[PDB]
Amino acid sequence: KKIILITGASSGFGRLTAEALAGAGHRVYASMRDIVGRNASNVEAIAGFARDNDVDLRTLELDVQSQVSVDRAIDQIIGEDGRIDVLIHNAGHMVFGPAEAFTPEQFAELYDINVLSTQRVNRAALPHMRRQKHGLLIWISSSSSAGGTPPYLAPYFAAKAAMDAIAVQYARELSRWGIETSIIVPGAFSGVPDDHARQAEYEAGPNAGLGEEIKKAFAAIVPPDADVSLVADAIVRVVGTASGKRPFRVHVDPAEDGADVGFSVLDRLRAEMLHRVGLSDLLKPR
Amino acid sequence: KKIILITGASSGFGRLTAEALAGAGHRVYASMRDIVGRNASNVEAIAGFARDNDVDLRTLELDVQSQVSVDRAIDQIIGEDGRIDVLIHNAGHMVFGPAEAFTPEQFAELYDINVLSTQRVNRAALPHMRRQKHGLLIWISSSSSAGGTPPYLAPYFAAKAAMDAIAVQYARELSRWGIETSIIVPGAFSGVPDDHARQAEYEAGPNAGLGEEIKKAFAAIVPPDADVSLVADAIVRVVGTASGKRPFRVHVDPAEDGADVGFSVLDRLRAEMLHRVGLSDLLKPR
Numbered sequence: 042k043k044i045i046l047i048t049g050a051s052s053g054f055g056r057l058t059a060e061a062l063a064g065a066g067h068r069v070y071a072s073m074r075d076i077v078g079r080n081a082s083n084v085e086a087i088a089g090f091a092r093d094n095d096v097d098l099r100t101l102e103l104d105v106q107s108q109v110s111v112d113r114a115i116d117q118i119i120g121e122d123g124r125i126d127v128l129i130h131n132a133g134h135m136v137f138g139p140a141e142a143f144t145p146e147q148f149a150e151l152y153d154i155n156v157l158s159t160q161r162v163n164r165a166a167l168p169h170m171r172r173q174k175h176g177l178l179i180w181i182s183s184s185s186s187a188g189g190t191p192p193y194l195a196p197y198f199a200a201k202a203a204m205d206a207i208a209v210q211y212a213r214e215l216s217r218w219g220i221e222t223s224i225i226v227p228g229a230f231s232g233v234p235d236d237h238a239r240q241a242e243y244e245a246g247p248n249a250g251l252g253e254e255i256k257k258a259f260a261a262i263v264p265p266d267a268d269v270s271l272v273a274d275a276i277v278r279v280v281g282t283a284s285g286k287r288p289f290r291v292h293v294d295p296a297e298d299g300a301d302v303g304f305s306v307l308d309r310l311r312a313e314m315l316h317r318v319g320l321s322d323l324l325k326p327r
Numbered sequence: 328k329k330i331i332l333i334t335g336a337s338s339g340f341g342r343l344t345a346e347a348l349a350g351a352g353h354r355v356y357a358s359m360r361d362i363v364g365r366n367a368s369n370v371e372a373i374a375g376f377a378r379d380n381d382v383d384l385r386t387l388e389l390d391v392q393s394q395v396s397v398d399r400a401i402d403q404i405i406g407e408d409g410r411i412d413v414l415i416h417n418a419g420h421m422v423f424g425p426a427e428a429f430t431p432e433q434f435a436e437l438y439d440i441n442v443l444s445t446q447r448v449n450r451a452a453l454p455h456m457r458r459q460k461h462g463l464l465i466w467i468s469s470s471s472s473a474g475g476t477p478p479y480l481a482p483y484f485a486a487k488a489a490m491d492a493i494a495v496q497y498a499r500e501l502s503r504w505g506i507e508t509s510i511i512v513p514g515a516f517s518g519v520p521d522d523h524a525r526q527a528e529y530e531a532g533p534n535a536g537l538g539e540e541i542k543k544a545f546a547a548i549v550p551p552d553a554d555v556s557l558v559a560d561a562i563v564r565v566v567g568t569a570s571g572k573r574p575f576r577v578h579v580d581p582a583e584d585g586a587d588v589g590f591s592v593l594d595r596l597r598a599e600m601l602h603r604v605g606l607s608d609l610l611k612p613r
Contacts, residue, residue, distance in 0.1 A: 140446075140449075145446045152489070156485065157435060160430075164431070188596055189603070203485035206485045217534050218534070246457070255606070261604070318547070
């Protein structure tokens with residue numbers, strides 16, 4: 042029985058994952074921003090599930106955009122439980138529109154939400170996990186960072202691509218500390234540009250209709266019975282695998298956009314390089 | 328003879344590329360920050376080359392971290408020449424150290440320099456290129472976004488990974504406007520963490536010596552005669568290729584870290600997806 046923290050768990054993969062892990066008997070902290078306001082109903086929904094099923098599912102206020110918020114929440118868990126066994130980076134947020142119409146700040150904000158968030162959380166949690174010389178980081182990545190993708194989500198896909206690159210780096214840099222990494226790669230199963238005038242130029246020029254054309258074409262390739270719970274069940278299986286035998290990436294992509302193939306080539310090239318330079322021990326947590 | 332703007336051209340690939348393009352007879356704006364202070368010598372070096380060789384190489388103040396700076400510089404070129412035929416995104420900056428020891432702001436700053444920079448420049452330049460219905464964006468990407476890589480450069484590799492994802496998106500989103508894209512993928516041929524205490528923990532724990540071990544192991548695989556001018560010559564060749572027949576990516580990687588293989592798989596999967604959804608026209612500028 043593990044102590045687990047998941048970020049951005051108000052709904053989506055985050056929430057089903059927190060519930061499935063708690064179903065598997067773990068002590069699960071399902072964290073999220075603004076539990077008194079914006080997420081009050083989600084808190085109620087999750088709390089009701091936890092009591093109805095008699096599982097150790099707890100909700101925790103954790104705003105990943107605030108270091109002070111993050112620090113407080115990590116201190117609560119450590120003061121209560123002594124450690125974190127599994128850290129699940131899931132907080133995220135996407136957008137749609139012509140990249141040119143998104144402002145520089147918009148891209149920055151996206152980075153904040155999808156990447157800087159993980160760094161705040163890691164900088165808070167990692168000191169404790171490093172003292173244990175043991176632990177598992179799970180990152181919810183995205184098939185888009187190495188598979189076929191639609192146009193019109195650039196600030197989002199950029200941030201996710203950076204997030205996966207960072208996950209990979211930590212995997213190596215934490216391995217001598219005994220910390221394991223597993224990256225979940227979900228396929229296809231939300232803001233817009235602030236520059237309305239620029240977007241209107243796109244709509245009246247050669248890209249007229251492209252936005253809707255993209256949404257429809259990409260919706261159409263998702264199997265109608267594709268279920269987001271597949272991701273939660275992949276995660277319960279990772280957590281339930283013996284230490285040292287966890288997969289590095291798990292692909293859950295009913296639309297089969299190819300990230301399984303892309304990443305398995307990238308993963309192979311990256312390992313090849315570490316063998317080549319005499320650093321193959323970084324491929325395997327101590 | 329083309330009108331060309333290159334960012335971050337004070338030295339490095341940027342500078343040799345500006346000189347080679349000017350050698351090929353183009354009108355080249357080699358832009359950079361702070362030409363009166365920090366880059367005054369670089370300005371002198373470049374200006375001396377231009378007069379000695381009698382080439383149309385011009386230096387231009389352009390601070391990619393300032394929208395006002397960017398706008399001014401683009402207005403100067405357009406007021407002088409009427410258009411930009413080739414836009415070369417090259418401004419960049421790297422760092423080395425354990426990812427945990429870099430602060431959230433540090434990662435943000437890196438993103439600013441390596442990604443938000445291109446967005447400021449694109450938002451300024453693209454309206455003009457779109458009116459022409461013609462033009463070429465060249466991005467200087469990095470073998471690290473799809474090849475074997477060292478640990479200890481996470482904020483940098485993250486930013487470059489996002490930058491490549493963005494380049495790919497613009498390639499599709501600009502194609503109906505007639506704008507071509509080519510991405511240069513240079514292999515191996517500089518700040519540090521602000522959190523000294525955290526870095527000192529890494530140095531005294533299980534990652535003792537890893538920093539130097541990485542620098543030495545990765546230096547050793549670069550062929551001693553690998554020359555950075557290979558990149559400049561690849562770019563002159565792209566620019567000199569007929570419109571509509573430019574390669575999408577050009578790999579220049581003497582250490583052979585595998586990004587050629589990684590990207591050619593990713594490129595294939597991405598095209599496959601656009602054919603699959605009926606958007607294959609996005610693969611080919613109008």
